[PDB]
Ligand binder design. Sequence first.
Ligand SMILES: Cc1c(C(=O)C(N)=O)c2c(OCC(=O)O)cccc2n1Cc1ccccc1C(F)(F)F
Ligand SMILES: [Ca+2]
Ligand SMILES: [Cl-]
Ligand SMILES: [Cl-]
Length: 123
Amino acid sequence: NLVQFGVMIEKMTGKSALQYNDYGCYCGIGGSHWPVDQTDWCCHAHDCCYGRLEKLGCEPKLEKYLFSVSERGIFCAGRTTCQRLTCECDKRAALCFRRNLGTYNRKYAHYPNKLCTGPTPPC
Ligand SMILES: Cc1c(C(=O)C(N)=O)c2c(OCC(=O)O)cccc2n1Cc1ccccc1C(F)(F)F
Ligand SMILES: [Ca+2]
Ligand SMILES: [Cl-]
Ligand SMILES: [Cl-]
């Protein structure tokens, strides 16, 4: 249930959402070992954000929220607090991606999971 996040990613980065799937060791489902770069740390932080939401009773993988983008930035909304929290985790990630556009490297898109090595940093 990832239409909204993808749309947020595209608005904020100018790239297709597909460019952030399987990026590094953390972007995409699950993740492990040490983040390859700052964009990947965004995804590590995002996974941590979702785990916090799951411990609150939310289902952030499934929640559908509402959002807009102006110049003031990204405005999050939703009927429930869980939807709004999901939007906040995604927003922080999309902003993090935009902020690190400067070190985004195409070589890490679709990164083979065997190249993920090191310890798994804690949340
Ligand atoms: C960037 C990202 C994710 C992350 O932010 C992350 N931390 O792993 C992500 C994701 O993470 C949620 C999680 O693993 O808890 C699952 C599926 C696709 C994901 N993607 C890619 C993505 C995002 C939005 C819409 C579509 C896609 C996709 F996969 F189609 F490219
Ligand atoms: Ca992930
Ligand atoms: Cl976060
Ligand atoms: Cl609803």
